């Protein structure tokens, strides 16, 4: 998967930055998922943190 985004200014591209607005690019095709979902509670705690839950 080569396509990348720079979601803030919302532009796809295969490059590492969107010079037009200087935001680095993340990979387009969003993190895989298994119903297992280990890291489940482990991530949950990281989120609860940035919200204050």
């Amino acid at each position: 998967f080569r396509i990348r985004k720079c979601p803030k200014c919302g532009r796809y591209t295969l490059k590492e930055v969107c010079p037009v607005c200087g935001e680095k690019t993340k990979v387009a095709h969003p993190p895989r998922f298994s119903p297992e979902d280990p890291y489940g509670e482990y991530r949950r705690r990281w989120k609860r943190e940035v919200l204050g839950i």
Binding site: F1, R2, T13, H29, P30, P31, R43, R48
Partner: protein, 320 residues
């Protein structure tokens, strides 16, 4: 970037001063969380990997839902916008099916060719195509837009009419261009009224928010996760109907002309329509038996045959 659904209509007024009693109704805004789900669709961002249904599969289990369905079947490897409609709202998917769809692609040519030729050729498609896969029905390509070309990789966006297969569109270009090409990576950017905006959410976010709701009792997040079925018809031409009529169409009444309060421009014979309350909730879906103007000038006969109704009965008092 213009598809067939981004042309703005006018709000045509029939009953210049009409009103609705709050006492019997639930506007999309403030429905109780537990029923917002009964009547929601999640704008899902499908990960690669799972088939499209096998996603819905997990959405069910993990949210202890019974009955939920999805929009345009997005294949295993495609990522992107996959409206998944829940509980009683399941069939709104009907609405979605024959709407626009935008993709970001990444065709990969099986041989070199002059940058501009690629551009020249792909722009050749903007219009109608007759489908030619490897060794009969026509399909529209509303627009192609080439983002970047690196070597034989061609990253583009493209908008298409329901049930174009992008793989083919590419294979076709492939032959058009001479060298032959294969589609390397794909992603759906929008299905119709479901865009890649702030409402599009990833499995993970969905689950984590849902757990914030059960373990933690925070409603907020897991609500902003689900979209109210109304957004599943946003693209359809709507007709707002006065209160008394609501109760009726519910029970299986075809909506007759003097129910209409507000109307949309440019409706025709046999077009899908969204029957709405003045509270802007989805009542039902139908085929118009009467054009836009026809409905506004008249008071005799029926506007829309009703064919599927979402609105529940007790929601509006009977009275007719």
């Amino acid at each position: 970037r213009i598809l067939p659904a981004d042309i703005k209509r006018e709000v045509l007024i029939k009953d210049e001063n009409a009103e609705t009693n709050p006492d019997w109704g639930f506007p999309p805004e403030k429905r109780p969380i537990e029923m917002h789900i009964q009547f929601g669709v999640i704008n899902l961002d499908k990960p690669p990997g799972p088939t499209s249904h096998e996603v819905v599969a997990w959405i069910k289990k993990i949210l202890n839902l019974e009955k939920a369905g999805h929009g345009g079947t997005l294949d295993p490897k495609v990522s992107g916008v996959l409206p998944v409609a829940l509980e009683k709202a399941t069939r709104v998917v009907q609405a979605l099916l024959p709407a626009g769809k935008e993709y970001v692609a990444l065709m990969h040519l099986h041989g070199d060719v002059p940058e501009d030729k690629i551009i020249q050729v792909m722009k050749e498609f903007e219009g109608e195509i007759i489908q030619r896969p490897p060794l009969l029905r026509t399909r529209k390509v509303y627009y192609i837009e080439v983002l970047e070309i690196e070597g034989r990789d061609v990253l583009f966006r493209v908008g298409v009419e329901a049930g174009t297969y992008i793989r083919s569109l590419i294979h076709h270009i492939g032959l058009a261009l001479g060298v032959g090409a294969h589609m390397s990576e794909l992603r759906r950017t929008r299905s119709g009224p479901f865009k890649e905006d702030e409402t599009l959410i990833t499995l993970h976010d969905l689950v984590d928010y849902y757990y914030f709701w059960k373990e933690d009792g925070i409603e907020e997040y897991f609500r902003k996760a689900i979209q109210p079925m109304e957004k599943a018809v946003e693209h359809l031409p709507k007709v707002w109907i006065k209160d008394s009529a609501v109760a009726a169409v519910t029970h299986g009444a075809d909506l007759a002309v003097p129910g209409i309060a507000k109307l949309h421009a440019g409706i025709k014979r046999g077009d899908l329509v969204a029957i709405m309350t003045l509270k802007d909730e989805l009542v039902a879906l139908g085929k118009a038996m009467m054009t836009s103007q026809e409905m506004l000038e008249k008071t005799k006969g029926i506007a829309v045959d009703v064919e599927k109704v979402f609105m529940p009965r007790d929601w509006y008092p009977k009275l007719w």
